[PDB]
Amino acid sequence: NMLLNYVPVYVMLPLGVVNVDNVFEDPDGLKEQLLQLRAAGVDGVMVDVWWGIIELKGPKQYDWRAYRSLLQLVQECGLTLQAIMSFHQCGGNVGDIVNIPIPQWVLDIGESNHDIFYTNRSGTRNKEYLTVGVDNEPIFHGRTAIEIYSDYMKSFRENMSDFLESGLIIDIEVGLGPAGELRYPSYPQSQGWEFPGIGEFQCYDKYLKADFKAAVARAGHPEWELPDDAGKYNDVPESTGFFKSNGTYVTEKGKFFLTWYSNKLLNHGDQILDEANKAFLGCKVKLAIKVSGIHWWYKVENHAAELTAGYYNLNDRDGYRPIARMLSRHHAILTFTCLEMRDSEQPSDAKSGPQELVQQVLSGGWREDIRVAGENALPRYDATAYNQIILNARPQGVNNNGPPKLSMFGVTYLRLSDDLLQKSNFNIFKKFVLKMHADQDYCANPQKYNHAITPLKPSAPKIPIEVLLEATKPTLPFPWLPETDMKVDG
Numbered sequence: 001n002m003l004l005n006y007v008p009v010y011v012m013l014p015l016g017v018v019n020v021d022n023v024f025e026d027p028d029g030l031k032e033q034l035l036q037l038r039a040a041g042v043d044g045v046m047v048d049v050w051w052g053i054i055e056l057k058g059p060k061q062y063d064w065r066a067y068r069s070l071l072q073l074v075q076e077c078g079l080t081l082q083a084i085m086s087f088h089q090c091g092g093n094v095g096d097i098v099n100i101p102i103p104q105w106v107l108d109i110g111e112s113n114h115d116i117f118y119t120n121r122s123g124t125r126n127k128e129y130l131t132v133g134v135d136n137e138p139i140f141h142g143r144t145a146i147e148i149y150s151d152y153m154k155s156f157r158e159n160m161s162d163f164l165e166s167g168l169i170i171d172i173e174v175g176l177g178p179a180g181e182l183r184y185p186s187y188p189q190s191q192g193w194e195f196p197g198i199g200e201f202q203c204y205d206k207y208l209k210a211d212f213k214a215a216v217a218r219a220g221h222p223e224w225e226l227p228d229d230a231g232k233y234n235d236v237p238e239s240t241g242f243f244k245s246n247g248t249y250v251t252e253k254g255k256f257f258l259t260w261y262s263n264k265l266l267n268h269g270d271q272i273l274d275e276a277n278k279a280f281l282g283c284k285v286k287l288a289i290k291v292s293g294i295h296w297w298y299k300v301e302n303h304a305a306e307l308t309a310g311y312y313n314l315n316d317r318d319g320y321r322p323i324a325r326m327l328s329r330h331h332a333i334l335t336f337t338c339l340e341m342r343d344s345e346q347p348s349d350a351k352s353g354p355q356e357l358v359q360q361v362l363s364g365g366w367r368e369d370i371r372v373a374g375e376n377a378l379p380r381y382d383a384t385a386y387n388q389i390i391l392n393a394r395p396q397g398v399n400n401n402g403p404p405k406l407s408m409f410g411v412t413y414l415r416l417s418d419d420l421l422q423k424s425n426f427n428i429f430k431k432f433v434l435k436m437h438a439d440q441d442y443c444a445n446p447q448k449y450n451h452a453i454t455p456l457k458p459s460a461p462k463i464p465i466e467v468l469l470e471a472t473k474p475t476l477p478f479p480w481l482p483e484t485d486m487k488v489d490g
């Protein structure tokens with residue numbers, strides 16, 4: 001039956017649906033838009049549950065009232081919800097049209113201890129997310145950063161228990177860094193970065209610096225220092241001593257650093273996921289994380305942009321499968337945030353390979369037997385973008401005699417706006433939804449298309465770092481069709 005080829009479609013709600021003052025501004029306005037989505041066959045919506053709004057007043061001073069009103073409306077409109085535990089700031093990244101800082105009281109601590117923020121070689125502090133360096137430092141009025149994230153998720157679970165029990169919430173996306181993605185803020189627009197700059201390493205806060213220095217000493221090279229020849233945000237790889245042919249990235253020093261740098265992210269995600277699993281244990285929901293799609297410089301040996309962001313991915317070293325393997329113990333979903341792009345849409349001097357990157361990441365996930373979901377990186381309303389998303393959703397087309405051998409768990413579209421609801425654009429969107437559903441009408445019961453949600457079980461045992469890193473072995477990706485068999489057309 002065709003329904004087994006059905007891939008659910010979700011739509012991101014506007015940023016700021018509940019403002020910085022914790023007020024659900026326009027319920028009536030949202031309602032009409034939501035009803036539009038319901039009529040279009042959309043399965044659900046995604047929303048940021050901003051930490052900076054909810055725990056603003058002070059430690060454990062949560063106010064969930066506005067969000068309870070929003071969830072109630074979503075439920076009345078017959079839509080499911082993907083909730084993001086957004087522990088980051090909204091404002092400094094592409095598309096951020098509203099400013100939502102992290103809790104003021106945390107910012108207050110940062111005034112006396114500037115090292116709680118990611119820091120570049122020049123010493124500029126980025127305030128959008130707390131550095132992984134303080135994950136386990138009890139410097140926030142007695143709590144560590146992870147305990148804060150943990151308490152937040154537990155409070156959410158208890159205060160939204162009725163919505164969880166009624167099955168409104170489908171999955172919990174755990175924010176792990178800038179824009180909620182598990183990565184370092186290596187390409188900050190707020191600091192002058194412009195595509196396709198290689199970006200900069202963000203490991204200079206005193207906590208990470210000390211950890212690194214202790215690490216190199218134990219490795220027998222106490223004299224090794226953090227990179228000093230990697231250039232600046234907008235540089236090109238060949239102009240740096242670190243990324244050029246036979247450069248530092250290829251030396252023992254460079255390899256040790258890149259391994260250390262990338263491992264920090266793996267442990268950061270693993271530890272916070274442990275807390276997320278405890279907070280939602282028993283709930284009929286799934287856990288997910290977001291991985292950024294850094295396609296620029298993907299086609300040169302140095303993969304500079306990926307490296308500075310924390311993804312130690314080279315032609316002979318898979319830096320994404322280790323992440324997938326880590327997610328397996330938590331039964332979590334890997335959400336890739338760049339699915340609509342085509343190589344030919346990128347400037348030549350950027351050496352972009354978004355198509356190849358997508359194939360590597362998704363294949364890595366299916367290889368490790370975890371569920372993979374995705375989102376488009378930039379706003380798109382044209383058929384070519386939708387057709388590329390559909391292609392990646394079912395790489396080998398639909399199976400007329402059962403489920404496809406390969407398919408994504410779901411796709412979330414960025415973002416709900418007046419532009420999307422314009423007659424012509426919305427008209428194409430409807431065809432996109434139909435094709436994602438493999439020509440089937442909207443299906444209310446996920447069980448029909450094998451997407452039944454069972455109670456979250458405790459995570460499996462800890463997987464040692466050496467076992468995780470075995471996943472760096474390069475593998476050939478799964479075969480991809482040149483174009484989808486479920487085209488939207490034009």
Ligand SMILES: OC[C@H]1O[C@H](O[C@H]2[C@H](O)[C@@H](O)[C@@H](O)O[C@@H]2CO)[C@H](O)[C@@H](O)[C@@H]1O
Pocket residue numbers: 012015047048084086089090091093094095096179180181290292293337338375376377378414
């Ligand atoms: O509302 C979700 C999320 O949206 C934005 O981040 C996106 C980004 O725009 C995409 O290009 C891609 O990277 O996925 C990101 C995560 O979904 C906001 O910047 C972010 O704050 C917000 O949480």
Ligand SMILES: OC[C@H]1O[C@H](O[C@H]2[C@H](O)[C@@H](O)[C@H](O)O[C@@H]2CO)[C@H](O)[C@@H](O)[C@@H]1O
Pocket residue numbers: 093094195293295338377
């Ligand atoms: O900021 C992260 C994104 O940067 C690029 O997006 C470019 C886009 O390609 C270009 O057409 C436009 O003029 O500028 C934006 C920068 O905001 C990458 O293409 C994206 O993949 C990144 O997510």
